[PDB]
Symmetry: C3
Subunit: 234 residues, 3 copies
Amino acid sequence: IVGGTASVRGEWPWQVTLHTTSPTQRHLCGGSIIGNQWILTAAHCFYGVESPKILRVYSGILNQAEIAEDTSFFGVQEIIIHDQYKMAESGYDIALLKLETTVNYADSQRPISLPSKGDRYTDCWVTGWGYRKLRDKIQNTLQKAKIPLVTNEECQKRYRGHKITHKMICAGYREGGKDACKGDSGGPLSCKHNEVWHLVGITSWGEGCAQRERPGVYTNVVEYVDWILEKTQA
Amino acid sequence: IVGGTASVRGEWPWQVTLHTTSPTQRHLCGGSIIGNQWILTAAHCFYGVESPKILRVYSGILNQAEIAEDTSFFGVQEIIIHDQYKMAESGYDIALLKLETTVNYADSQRPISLPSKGDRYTDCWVTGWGYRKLRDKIQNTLQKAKIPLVTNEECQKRYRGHKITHKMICAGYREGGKDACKGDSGGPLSCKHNEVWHLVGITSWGEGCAQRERPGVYTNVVEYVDWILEKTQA
Amino acid sequence: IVGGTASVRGEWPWQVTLHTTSPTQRHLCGGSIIGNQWILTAAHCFYGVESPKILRVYSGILNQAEIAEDTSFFGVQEIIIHDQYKMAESGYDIALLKLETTVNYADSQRPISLPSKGDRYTDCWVTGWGYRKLRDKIQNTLQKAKIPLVTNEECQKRYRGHKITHKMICAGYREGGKDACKGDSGGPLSCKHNEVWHLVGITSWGEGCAQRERPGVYTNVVEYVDWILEKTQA
Ligand SMILES: N=C(N)c1ccc2cc(C(=O)Nc3ccccc3)cc(Nc3ncccn3)c2c1
Ligand SMILES: N=C(N)c1ccc2cc(C(=O)Nc3ccccc3)cc(Nc3ncccn3)c2c1
Ligand SMILES: N=C(N)c1ccc2cc(C(=O)Nc3ccccc3)cc(Nc3ncccn3)c2c1
């Protein structure tokens, strides 16, 4: 996250850090708890991941320093990537992780509500342990930044070489300065409406990070609520 | 219906009583007229029904005592159950009855409008001839009860062993006392908005009837308007 | 267009005139620029069209007199008709034309935004070079008429022999007098909302033109945004 600040412990209890253990353990992406056995994240996080055996999901984390070899984690039983996904910039950048065990909800870890088709937001935040600038490194403390949504027409003007579809949502300041970046991929764009937090977007792509006239692009979660229901069925 | 009152004759002209003639004739479920040849109802009503030949639809009824062997009815040519339906509690609880003859609309019998995707309600009523308590019997006079809708987040808290999906809608009072019950299955949850009645829900399931902190669960009809259009085509 | 007035040059820069060259060149239908290589129009325009080789799309036109044998046009590489389309009156009346070359946007020719599912209008206009009455001829100057939308319930009362679905939108005055007509087929029903023009409808059918109690029927474009995205993908 560029231009953000440190989060308060437990203020984004749906946020997870997804690690890979290959070659050595490191944070790979963000994600969101949406159900007792389910994390919603970005499909592009799984480039080159041939097996879910190398993944670990950590919930209830503020600082990456909390994660040691003796820290509990959730194993991943299955990676479900949208069957129309090819690459972040062409959309469908959404994936589910089915966990091996169920999350026990607590003040530190609980699910975020999915947006309602009926709500198709002025208090939106992007969170993560990603870079603070394009060439940087993973941050210890979960960062947060408040960013305004921009219309799809506005976003399209900023990305003339792309097709900004109704299955994408954009957020950014005209002058830049606050945005998601590498490593924030897969995490939430969370919006508070009528005192309830909604998972409105999934961090997906953008040209650089926090540049002027280059909003962040996110998967528009409401366009996938039918897909999420279909894929999370027994 | 628990905690309801007798309806005025003709005030719910889309409501039908669906009877089975097997082994002897009795009310089986409610339904709603949505087209000249079409009744919308719940799929769970058809457990063990192997043929539409045993069904009779009666329109324009207030009291079951109006139904005698000499009373006119509509035969059922076809039962169309949603192909994803398995059981009420897992959703897709929706079915169409294609009638053998067409309904001639009148002050006693006319169709209810389907909800618009654009309207994704404070004046909602559930109606039927079902039980007044869990272990009871079919009622003579069509009953009505005004019940507030509850959010899907609220409903989910009341049914922790279920998945309350966006394809379901819930309605009930926190203290209970008014609800649908056995025998109301398949009937409408009708909401009046901008002076027009909309078929918002279909009576589907609930734990007990009218219990405290146990809202009634209904099929969210707006999530099926595309299915209804597809299935009612020639 | 019945009861309209001449347009100002460039005030509907998404409007195109689609011509056929067979047997001799003439205006066939209207359409709307929605992308650099894409025109959205009505499927019924292509009755008897066996090849896209006979089509020519002209952009930036006010008067048909501007079109001469030396006027530039866009060739059509492919006609994509909705696979559920059979006839205008039963819906799915939508088609895409993939152009052979891309449109270079200018003050005279630019795309209209598609409606958002979130916007599911009081300033709606229908435009075209069609007839001014049922038995007439193509008009030289692009005509415009402001027409109010009517609800689908109201529209259904006016077309009792048809099924007015949620995939259709109607517009008209109770007393008639302003409407689209033959030759306006395929053109836009454009609505201005929050200072942005949205392509809300595609001119499709109606009984006569501008008759009392016979609104114009249009394809409800918002119900096709997923189809448009699917079909315009590489
Ligand atoms: N500005 C953003 N909102 C954003 C969000 C996520 C990103 C993820 C990657 C990303 O997935 N990075 C990546 C992953 C694997 C391998 C290589 C790069 C790359 C980004 N942008 C970028 N721009 C220019 C050059 C490099 N990166 C993002 C911007
Ligand atoms: N409270 C409700 N809104 C509701 C609505 C419909 C129902 C239909 C059946 C239903 O379909 N009953 C049934 C049908 C066939 C065979 C056996 C039972 C059963 C219900 N609840 C219930 N709860 C506990 C024990 C028994 N029933 C309902 C509640
Ligand atoms: N009133 C309208 N909004 C409307 C719009 C488009 C139409 C297109 C055709 C149309 O597609 N005409 C056509 C095309 C090819 C062959 C024959 C007729 C026919 C119409 N109406 C009509 N009504 C009665 C008798 C004839 N036409 C329309 C009304």
